Amino acid sequence: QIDRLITGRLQSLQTYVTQQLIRAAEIRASANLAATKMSECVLGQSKRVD
Amino acid sequence: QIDRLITGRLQSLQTYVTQQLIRAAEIRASANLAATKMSECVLGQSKRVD
Amino acid sequence: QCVNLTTRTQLPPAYTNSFTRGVYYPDKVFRSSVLHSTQDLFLPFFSNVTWFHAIHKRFDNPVLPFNDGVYFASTEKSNIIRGWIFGTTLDSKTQSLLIVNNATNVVIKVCEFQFCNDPFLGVYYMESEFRVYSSANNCTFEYVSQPFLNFKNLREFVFKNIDGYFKIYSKHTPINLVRDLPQGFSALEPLVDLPIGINITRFQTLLALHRSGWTAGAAAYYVGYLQPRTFLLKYNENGTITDAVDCALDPLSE
Amino acid sequence: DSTECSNLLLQYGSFCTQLNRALTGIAVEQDKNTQEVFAQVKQIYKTPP
Amino acid sequence: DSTECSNLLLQYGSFCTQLNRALTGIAVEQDKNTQEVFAQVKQIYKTPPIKDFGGFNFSQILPDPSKPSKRSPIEDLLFNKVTNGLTVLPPLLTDEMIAQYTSALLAGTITSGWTFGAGP
Amino acid sequence: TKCTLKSFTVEKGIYQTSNFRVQPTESIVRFPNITNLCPFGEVFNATRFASVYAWNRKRISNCVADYSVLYNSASFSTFKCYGVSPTKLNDLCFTNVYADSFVIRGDEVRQIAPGQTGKIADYNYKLPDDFTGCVIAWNSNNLDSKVGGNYNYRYRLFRKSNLKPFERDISTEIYQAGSTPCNGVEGFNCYFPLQSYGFQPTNGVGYQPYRVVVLSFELLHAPATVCGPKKSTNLVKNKCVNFNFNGLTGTGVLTESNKKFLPFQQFGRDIADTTDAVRDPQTLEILDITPCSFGGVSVITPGTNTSNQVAVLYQGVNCTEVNVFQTRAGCLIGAEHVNNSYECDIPIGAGICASYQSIIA
Ligand SMILES: *[C@@H]1O[C@H](CO)[C@@H](O[C@@H]2O[C@H](CO)[C@@H](O)[C@H](O)[C@H]2NC(C)=O)[C@H](O)[C@H]1NC(C)=O
Ligand SMILES: *[C@@H]1O[C@H](CO)[C@@H](O[C@@H]2O[C@H](CO)[C@@H](O)[C@H](O)[C@H]2NC(C)=O)[C@H](O)[C@H]1NC(C)=O
Ligand SMILES: *[C@@H]1O[C@H](CO)[C@@H](O)[C@H](O)[C@H]1NC(C)=O
Ligand SMILES: *[C@@H]1O[C@H](CO)[C@@H](O)[C@H](O)[C@H]1NC(C)=O
Ligand SMILES: *[C@@H]1O[C@H](CO)[C@@H](O)[C@H](O)[C@H]1NC(C)=O
Ligand SMILES: *[C@@H]1O[C@H](CO)[C@@H](O)[C@H](O)[C@H]1NC(C)=O
Ligand SMILES: *[C@@H]1O[C@H](CO)[C@@H](O)[C@H](O)[C@H]1NC(C)=O
Ligand SMILES: *[C@@H]1O[C@H](CO)[C@@H](O)[C@H](O)[C@H]1NC(C)=O
Ligand SMILES: *[C@@H]1O[C@H](CO)[C@@H](O)[C@H](O)[C@H]1NC(C)=O
Structure with missing residues (x-):
């Protein structure tokens, strides 16, 4: 019974960590974009449209 | 028997959803690039090389 | 002792809408400022509830299936309804659960009683007439507690039989509405669990007669049926259920 | 359509809810992607005849 | 706290080490993200006490000295409008530090244009 | 740190090496009061016992039974359980x-046992081969015996067939020892089945009367109302203890709470469905459960090429529960806090960084 519980909880933890990694990749892309905007719009004037 | 089938199919579905999330992240990166190209090449003239 | 009642007037049973009543606390767990979703035997929102009348001449004491649960509501004045009879065959063949409330206290017994075809009590204008049973042979469980009890008192009761436990939920609500069920929300707090562990498939309500022949006291009660479904319960900061949602009523609540 | 299997699956928690939520997020993200790529002007311009 | 459960969990090897390592990687990546976005200047710039910028008014975006948090009114509004073995690690940069970065960036762009982003 | 990293050289940085846990000090078991006791005083020590051929059957249910009190009494010379411990x-x-309570002879006490065959076993009281419960027997030579001879107790000596298990037979039908027909009239080979016991004070051991109480246990699907006593210990608060409230167990810090439970509620749960408040069954006061302050243990160290001095960060742990410096990241041990400000060398969190100059924070 404890082995069944361990498999279930380990699967839940792995699912959480995997979706956290995917969300972290998305947030890292967003933060790289934010750093680029900080550099090019705040520290300079950008000719890039929109 | 149903427990065996349930854990197998749940693992298969979780694998499929993980691949779909990773592919969706890749396609979102491609679409962000395409929106940037639309803004900077279609709606303007770009000085950026290539 | 049994007495036939041959002065009734024929009348088909009525129906009315349950409105927003029948919600009870699923368990003994406190929750504060949390919206909790649970799956338990509940009385559905806006469903027809069978309506019985008792007015001078009407006297409605039939035998009805228990099914998976019963919601009992009673617009009660002058304390006409006194108890409930629980069992399957309502004779000496099987065993029955008796819930009564006479002038002193409530008695909860599990015995094999002999039930009359017409069980009722009697009020003399003082209570001096008990004709509901004729024998009591084999008892297995006896329990005594404190009594639970224009329309001025509204009583709601929910009865369940799960895993041999008998759960009684109740809530005393003061209203002033003349005929039908009022509109509002009132969660039914649990009162007492009876570890009876007996088979129950039928039930019967117990009334009281008036002597001045017999006169029917003015009363009206309702009997609902519990249906297993999912509810979304709202708990306020004080921990009481103030509003609920039936997840299978209409698409907005879903 | 097996009700026994679904009752057994209920003991595994909110895995199905998580997968459905992830797929719904991907589905709305696709429309967001197309929206961002193509709906960059609110005016429908037309060439002269 | 179950000893038997931990003994059984020891059969699965280093799964917990992998999960903790991945979460630690995410946690350090968040701080790195904040550094790349906000720590773009090594000089903490300040606006002059007199706010004579040729009629241009930056009060809504410059820090409010009256507030304890030293946040701009727009930043204050932004912070007001956003509300079992599990631990939450605090970020490396506090909100005051990030606000001080934003204040330095604002002072640099107001008083020196784009020149401070390419040199002195 | 070296053992966690599986390396004999450690680079400059901060590394999570273990997990801090506040180990519980006591075990607290709280249970409701022992009330509504079983009436064992009216069974074992009543006014008069019944005869064996008409043994009374006392039903004990809906109460708590303290079998230790009955067990530790020294007057019971026989306490034999055949299905339980x-x-x-x-x-x-x-x-x-x-x-079942009755009076039998001293030598017939051992006949109340599964697999034992005798006069009392066949015609007075029958036990099954898979009997469960305890048989309690003690001598009663000071109460049952009389100088004139106590003949009030009768026991069945003959029957055509043996008794079924737990069957009562109070019948006084004439036994036919021979083959001569008897219509209820005693003859030379037709006698009354009940014979009066010869309990006398002059009778020695073996002929002395014994009062035997036989306990039987049922394990049907009905609720098990009969349960043993519960030993609720004293309550300890404001400490990391292992609590046990009405069978719900766990580890946490029990503290006073301002939450007002509705009177029918016992336990409390949060939005994530974890028990955070419990009502004490002995004294009806609401206790707040805080988890014992665990945390991650991180070691702050420069490169081993530089120094072997380290600092320890207990993440999210107050310094009173573990060069002691309290940060918002946790309790920092081994680093001296300075009022200066330098660029971040090793990140601690919440604006604090550590560097080697000793190790400073
Ligand atoms: C009250 O009336 C009911 C039925 O109206 C009586 O029940 C019947 O009694 C007769 C009497 O011989 C029986 O033959 C029937 O079999 C009974 N019917 C059922 C369904 O059981 C009842 O006996 C009456 N009460 C009294 C006290 O006479
Ligand atoms: C710059 O803008 C701020 C706000 O937009 C001005 O502050 C206002 O000043 C007037 C009178 O001077 C007051 O009645 C308002 O209540 C002020 N508003 C706030 C939000 O403080 C400020 O005067 C403007 N000019 C300068 C030079 O700072
Ligand atoms: C309830 O039953 C009555 C008659 O049995 C019927 O007229 C009524 O429509 C029912 N209620 C609903 C909501 O269908
Ligand atoms: C109410 O019923 C109980 C149950 O037998 C009985 O003992 C009691 O006397 C009754 N009350 C009155 C007033 O007769
Ligand atoms: C139930 O009562 C009947 C008659 O009163 C009796 O014959 C029977 O033995 C009883 N059953 C039990 C289990 O006591
Ligand atoms: C309870 O009684 C009903 C009929 O009265 C029967 O169909 C059902 O099987 C019984 N249940 C049990 C558990 O005996
Ligand atoms: C909660 O209860 C307190 C007193 O017990 C009362 O003052 C307050 O109004 C209640 N709040 C709600 C939301 O019921
Ligand atoms: C008689 O037996 C009862 C059984 O509960 C016990 O409580 C009582 O102490 C006994 N009497 C004596 C004098 O020991
Ligand atoms: C149980 O015993 C305690 C001991 O003082 C007492 O305070 C309490 O009132 C008793 N009853 C209940 C129901 O807790």
């Missing part, structure tokens, strides 16, 4: 208890 009677739970 005597020391486990206070822990097990059963639906109902059947108590």
